Amino acid sequence: YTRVVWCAVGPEEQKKCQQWSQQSGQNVTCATASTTDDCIVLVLKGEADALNLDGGYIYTAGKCGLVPVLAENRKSSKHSSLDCVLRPTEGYLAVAVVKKANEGLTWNSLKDKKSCHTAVDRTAGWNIPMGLIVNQTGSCAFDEFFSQSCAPGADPKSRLCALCAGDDQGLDKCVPNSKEKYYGYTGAFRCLAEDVGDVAFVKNDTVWENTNGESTADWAKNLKREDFRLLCLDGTRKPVTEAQSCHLAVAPNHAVVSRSDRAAHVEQVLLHQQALFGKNGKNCPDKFCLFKSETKNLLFNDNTECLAKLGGRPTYEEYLGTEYVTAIANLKKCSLEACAF
Ligand SMILES: *[C@@H]1O[C@H](CO)[C@@H](O[C@@H]2O[C@H](CO)[C@@H](O[C@@H]3O[C@H](CO)[C@@H](O)[C@H](O)[C@@H]3O)[C@H](O)[C@H]2NC(C)=O)[C@H](O)[C@H]1NC(C)=O
Ligand SMILES: *[C@@H]1O[C@H](CO)[C@@H](O[C@@H]2O[C@H](CO)[C@@H](O)[C@H](O)[C@H]2NC(C)=O)[C@H](O)[C@H]1NC(C)=O
Ligand SMILES: *[C@@H]1O[C@H](CO)[C@@H](O[C@@H]2O[C@H](CO)[C@@H](O)[C@H](O)[C@H]2NC(C)=O)[C@H](O)[C@H]1NC(C)=O
Ligand SMILES: CC(C)/N=C\[C@@H](O)COc1cccc2ccccc12
Ligand SMILES: [Fe+3]
Numbered sequence: 001y002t003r004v005v006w007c008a009v010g011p012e013e014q015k016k017c018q019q020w021s022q023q024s025g026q027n028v029t030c031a032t033a034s035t036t037d038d039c040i041v042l043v044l045k046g047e048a049d050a051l052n053l054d055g056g057y058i059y060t061a062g063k064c065g066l067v068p069v070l071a072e073n074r075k076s077s078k079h080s081s082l083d084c085v086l087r088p089t090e091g092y093l094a095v096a097v098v099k100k101a102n103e104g105l106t107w108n109s110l111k112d113k114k115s116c117h118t119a120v121d122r123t124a125g126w127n128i129p130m131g132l133i134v135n136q137t138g139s140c141a142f143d144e145f146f147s148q149s150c151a152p153g154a155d156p157k158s159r160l161c162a163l164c165a166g167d168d169q170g171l172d173k174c175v176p177n178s179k180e181k182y183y184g185y186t187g188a189f190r191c192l193a194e195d196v197g198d199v200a201f202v203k204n205d206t207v208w209e210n211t212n213g214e215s216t217a218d219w220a221k222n223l224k225r226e227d228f229r230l231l232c233l234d235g236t237r238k239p240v241t242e243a244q245s246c247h248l249a250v251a252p253n254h255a256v257v258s259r260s261d262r263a264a265h266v267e268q269v270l271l272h273q274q275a276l277f278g279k280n281g282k283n284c285p286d287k288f289c290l291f292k293s294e295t296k297n298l299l300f301n302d303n304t305e306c307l308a309k310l311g312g313r314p315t316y317e318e319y320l321g322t323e324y325v326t327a328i329a330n331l332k333k334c335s336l337e338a339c340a341f
């Protein structure tokens with residue numbers, strides 16, 4: 001009680017966690033796994049308490065009895081009167097992004113192109129676009145739709161991993177952690193920016209955060225918003241300013257999950273942790289900021305303003321929404337209920 005073990009995915013999340021652990025006075029400690037699924041297993045066993053998950057994994061976790069505790073909440077124009085912790089979460093926009101110079105590439109001509117996914121089983125990077133594609137083609141052969149992909153977490157020797165690059169040394173090709181060059185929102189967008197892939201499946205925010213000087217990372221320094229287009233489902237292409245009307249779906253925010261028996265305790269610690277290291281935390285800019293990691297989205301997305309209370313004490317199914325749960329169920333038919341472990 002009062003002590004929470006956080007599960008870090010990969011070495012860079014471990015390093016961030018160790019620092020947070022140090023600054024928390026060991027009120028938070030760290031477990032590390034190579035994959036998010038392994039972190040989920042550590043939580044089930046009771047060897048870790050919590051990690052922040054994409055909605056695709058909240059679905060995995062939820063079937064195993066884990067619960068949403070607090071959600072990532074980003075910058076808002078509406079509800080602005082309300083305190084961030086009490087403000088409802090809005091959801092992010094899942095988009096398909098292409099290079100402008102790649103003229104005449106539309107939603108309807110993606111077959112045999114090269115693709116960049118955040119990771120297998122993630123909302124924007126996988127579940128939404130491949131759910132749409134399985135539906136549209138009436139085929140479960142989503143391994144044969146694109147000529148080559150980087151989809152971290154797929155078989156490293158299938159074409160779904162052909163475009164993945166591994167780490168500094170070429171090791172760890174296609175691992176679903178940040179050692180993979182093209183892992184996650186930032187990695188998938190980089191995959192597109194370097195013209196390894198033709199399309200990246202990311203969220204609206206990723207384009208903005210890595211273009212027009214917002215990043216300063218060497219691959220992203222010279223990236224310009226006007227050089228990218230969104231692919232809409234009507235066959236159109238739009239500027240990245242038109243995400244409201246050109247997206248694949250609205251995605252439930254990333255959320256902290258814990259075993260239901262630990263939820264209350266995890267919630268209490270985390271609220272106090274963000275008072276100290278969150279956006280206006282006592283200690284953030286000065287000693288440690290929970291929600292920064294130079295564009296890398298380690299443990300939390302860099303654009304998190306705060307972690308919000310849920311309210312309505314939602315199950316994972318109500319948190320994800322029936323719309324999203326049925327999408328995943330339908331897609332998982334290709335690869336009807338149980339915990340995977
Ligand atoms: C790909 O297609 C599948 C199969 O249709 C989609 O599942 C279908 O989509 C709709 C939208 O969620 C579901 O209909 C709804 O269901 C409830 C009660 O059934 C109803 O009250 C709603 O107003 C709405 O009519 C439908 O259940 C579902 N069909 C099946 C067989 O499950 C799936 O969503 C698609 N995948 C993606 C990413 O679009
Ligand atoms: C580690 O956790 C303990 C217990 O929650 C914290 O101790 C409390 O600190 C606050 C602020 O200093 C006080 O108002 C309480 O009276 C303390 N006692 C309790 C409730 O046990 C401690 O601050 C935490 N350390 C860090 C740096 O996060
Ligand atoms: C797409 O994402 C971007 C980046 O998150 C959003 O632009 C931000 O909007 C907030 C408040 O709405 C502003 O205060 C920020 O300055 C913007 N960020 C940057 C870096 O430009 C944009 O609103 C999103 N669009 C949609 C349709 O959701
Ligand atoms: C008690 C419940 C209803 N309240 C908190 C959560 O459900 C919020 O979850 C959600 C978070 C983000 C997007 C979402 C889209 C549809 C439905 C729920 C979403
Ligand atoms: Fe996501």
Ligand SMILES: [Zn+2]
Binds near residue numbers: 247249250
């Ligand atoms: Zn919409």
Ligand SMILES: [Zn+2]
Binds near residue numbers: 312313314315318
């Ligand atoms: Zn409920």
